[PDB]
Amino acid sequence: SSLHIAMFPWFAMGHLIPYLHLSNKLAKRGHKISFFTPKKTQTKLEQFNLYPNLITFYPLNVPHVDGLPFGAETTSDVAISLGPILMTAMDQTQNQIELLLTQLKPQIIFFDFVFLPKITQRLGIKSFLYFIINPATISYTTSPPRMFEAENLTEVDLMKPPKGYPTSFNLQSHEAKHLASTRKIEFGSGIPFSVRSYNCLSLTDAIGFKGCREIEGPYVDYLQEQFGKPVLLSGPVLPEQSKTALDEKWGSWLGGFKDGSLVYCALGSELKLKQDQFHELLLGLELTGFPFLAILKPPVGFETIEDALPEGFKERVKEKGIVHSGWIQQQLILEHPSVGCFVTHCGAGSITEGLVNNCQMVLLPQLNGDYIINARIMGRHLKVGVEVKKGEEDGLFTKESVYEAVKIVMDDENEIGREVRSNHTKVRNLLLRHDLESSCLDTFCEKLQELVS
Template identity: 25%
Template sequence: MDSTTAFRHLHFVFIPLMAPGHLLPMVDMAKLFARRKVRASIVTTPLNSIQFQDSIEREIQSGSPIQILHVQFPCAEAGLPEGCESLDTLPSMDLQTNFNIAMNLLQQPLQDLLEKLRPFPSCIIADKHFLCVADVADKLNVPRIIFDGTNCFFLLCNHNLDKYKVHEAVSGEEKFLVPGMPHRIELCRSQLPGIFNPGTKLKLQAYREKVREVSKRAYGIVVNSFEELEVEYVKEYQRVTGHKVWCVGPVSLSNKDDMDKALRSKRNSSDEVEYLMKWLDSWPPRSVIYVCLGSLNRATPEQLIELGLGLEATKRPFIWVLRGAYGREEMEKWLLEEGFEERVKERGVVMNGWVPQVLILSHGAIGAFLTHCGWNSTLEGICGGVPLVTFPLFAEQFYNEKVVAQVVEIGVSVGAESVVHLGEEYNSRVQVTRENFKDSIEKVMGEGREKEEIRERARKYGNMAKKAIEQCGSSYLNMSKLIHDIVRVKGLDQS
């Protein structure tokens, strides 16, 4: 049987976590596999599928063997309000434990669904946080590959901290050197993700430990990154762990034209998208600041106000995306009572809710991206070829800042010093002033040789990213290796 025929006998099942930052990259990845003529099924809930259904319909019309399969989310059984089927829809992060309970309750429905699939699943690619999938895969005797959602820098850093535990010997604000990293990486304990820096609420710690334990049992790890971005970290992580790792990103580049980018997540009306694009068209190349702190933004209203005043002080055009999350009502009150939008209306757009970020970042008018350093946003900024202004908030975001500002040197930090723990936002303080924001933006958008060098490196890595997923690019070839590995495991090459 030749490889093309073997590919047609494969059936990859993708099971994403129900949260935008986890869901959308796995949908993009499924599209890339299906374009290689591997049958791809995306399993999620009906409400979650609405946002990307049009995108998948477009893939099907083009001939891709891809489909969406549904399971019902057990909101009531887990003590969640009806309709809370995604992390970003929870009315309070105190309900995150209930959300995890709901995901575990999906074990039997998932097993029943996958058992009946024809062709039978050859491989399951699941978000590492979807713990019950491990038991489903074991019972069905199907190889399970985890989608980590981060990068090899993160994987290696966590591995080395877990092994050497150097962070345990320092106080919260004291810097320490992370051992075994290809670059000299210094962090503070206060900047580490929850597994090493859990804050005062420890109820999620057992869950984090379980995620790490279950991840070790996986057949391998698929990573939304590309080797040219972090080649030393890919090699070193594989060397010290022996884990199978496939870098197949940036998967957002599966959305090639403006229609793909606009349909990637259907949360905006076409009128809103058209307005944003026309507004961007009205500005010179590389002149607009784009600001978004992610779908789970945890910055306090006081901190966001400093950000807004910093944007105003730059006197540059900007798009500022406010997605609610923590303190939404307070921010809306400030915007209204202080007249911020009225003051900046000639050059600033404030958007509430979701925007087509990949489409915006690909527009030639964008000159810088002020980001929370979630890995999806970081990669999307890199793909746009624009310098990044980094404002990490929680999880692995301080790691990603190191990749941007130190490893590849395509951005600058605003100076955040510590994680804002989920559910403990009220304890956080204003870490970054309006002056910090303004000065950091000028470091990548102003005149001067150093600033132009940052911009040139950003353009260079943007081009590398695009080449990585093209035919014969590093990520394209890694995807081929993964597919052939599953062909071998399933014995299809012997047929």
Template identity: 25%
Template sequence: MDTTGSELKPHFVLVPLMAQGHMIPMVDMARLLAEHDATVTFVTTPVNASRIKAIIERIEASQLPIKFLKLQFPCEKVGLPEGYESADLLSGLDQIMKFVDASAMLKESLITCLKEQYHLPVCIIADTNLPWVGDVARELSVPRLAFNGSGAFPNLAMYIIRHRKIFDDVKDDKEIISIPGFPHRLEMTKAKAPLSVYRPGMEQFTEKRLKEERIADGMVVNSFYELESLYVESYSKTTGKKVWTIGPMLLCNKNIHEFSSRGNKASIDEEDCSLWLDSMKPGSVVYVSFGSLAQTTLAQLAEIGFGLEASNKPFVWVIKAGDKFSEVEEWLSNGFEERIKDQGLIIKGWAPQMMILSHPAIGGFLTHCGWNSTLESICTGVPMITWPHFADQFLNEMLVVEILKIGVKIGVEDPNQWATDESKNDNDVMVKRDDVAKAILELMDGGEKMRDRAQELARKGREAMDEGGSSFNNIKDLIKQFGDASKTAVVKP
């Protein structure tokens, strides 16, 4: 029989884009909601669940009220290879479009599963790159919040650029364009603009995505007010929606970011990595990692290595080479690993990034400027050397270097697009070894003020997540606002 669910905790459904950099922050969000007295259904697929198996096991051991709903991903129906259930496994526009179509096919099964649950959701929080979730929310008559995975600064800029179609009629990729409606002067070229998912053949998806972003019931941002207050306020004004900053969410989820990737195993365990770092002086080591999606040619990888060697600074270098790993292994073994054995630690595959960044020996982070990595660096008080590749990363570089003043540019002017159909020449090089060494020396030998600012931001980030802090209060407010609806929610017998 029907009854009221006043005694039930409010139930939130989280639907992440299936990609490493998008899933992990939403896992953090699930834990954060559950720790603040909500229940959570986290939507995933079998392959993606297996890739975060360690995370799921730790959450289950914690007995937090989080359910992982595993929907069958229809690879075969769209012509994707079996198991291609995550965006970081894709290559080329054809596979991207098939992945988009397959993701949308999850709509009916998700609606069915949620209708069958004992406790209906009070809110769905979904990645903006999954516009079909808007149909799910309307079918269930529940509000939907949009989550992009970026900070307020890049989210605001991306919203203006995409909805006002700023670059649609710009022919010259190098022409500097002023972005209207931003709270201060902001200029960028089309080449650096976050347009990588807007490609020929994806017009229908693009329009649906923009429409669903416009009609969302609010925005959730993995950041904290004290870091981006000007942009939080402007983002809310521009969209006409409430913006909840509930980060840095990673602080609620320390030491559980374990993510496996097919053919991309770790070459060193956390204990050995920690022991190596323990042998180094505080603040002396450069950490180098470009995330899960960046594609680096063999020639460019060699230039990075030679630049690290020439800097004479200790380093930890994470290499993810995918199907090029045999060639990378050959290059490394051809004298390089032997020469740097006392200077550097090379990790092939996955690396315990938060553990590394948190270590006192780390003094700088050479990063691709993905928002997750940027936030991790801020939260550990580590200044950055910025090497953006695509999407929001050039905007994140602007925030880090020009606004927060906690980073040094390596000098990249052109994007290195993800999953492009254009073949890459293994001899292509964007950044020379001298540029790598120069940026490292500039940060490591003259970055004390940047380091002080980064550590101050780290303190503010911790305070935001502590009881009474801005993000703590926002997550409470979010749950209360949508949780009030659970007092009259219908539950099933």
């Protein structure tokens, strides 16, 4: 039988988009989806609704919280430092979520962050904490062994995996420092960030992750052993086709470059670089001599790209490079044959989009546990990309380190570049295998049926 699933993702494009990708896959299997979305954001989500008779948007009014800029709905509308206030606003949607669940009566609700399971169990609804970040990240930072150390969890503690963690990778000091401090910072309604997610893991009926057994398997198994409840895999949430074609201005411009020659650089929809690293990144792209498209917000303190560019940059780069601040159709650009290289911040969505395409992967993780852990998995486990070197303590890169990573992967004769191309091809062939996502979804849906039995 078909399930009625409500979707309540976090107010971030990187969550709304894969939740919608998955919603389309579920609706293709006949499941009815009630998709909760901030009101104004719905208009930008319609392009992805491929089953409007089965996927219905229900608007949420993102409530005022002091400090939240007026009208803000998504982390793409606020500075990164304001995310915790937006999380308070998500928390404050509880009354309109309660009303929506009582009138719609879904069997399951997929959610982020809102540690909701008390409400759903009162209503006879199953709660499903559905992560679109890597289970390797949640396992590394939010498994019980981490939380029981409470505020005795040090940067040195975070340099090693929690007890029983299934794999090995190295963090730099500044990354472990980042994880040790930001973990404690309130993220909505006075709740420390890692405590919030731990509460969700603890209180939810079941957990799910974007991913497949071949890659995410060991972490989902670890989390299932740790939290003693089902930890499902949706499949890798392969991007679905939008109803909107590639913007002709980008299509025309990209079409003027030789196949595989262009370096696409984008650091997601939330973050702003500081100026010095904005400069180093752009000068590093320039040093390669390849054409490039860099999708970047103006750096901290600046309101336009033009004002922040290194001196003489436009005049030197001429028509071979564009630095652009607006939202673009990233998935469609990564499919364009001109793109030979993706310099990515290693956001989980961007990783999948790179993996399913042909672009060589250059890993520029920004300071966020999921970006960093994605970068280590991609660079050291799957070995599908080359990571730009950062200072051990300062977390900064040089323009030369950017240059060298792009040069390595774009050089047909470079053995490391050939290696990551070959490994990327192996991973792409897995993710796109004719039965991989479908068999993941088969299992996913069977386990969801078990959840509501």
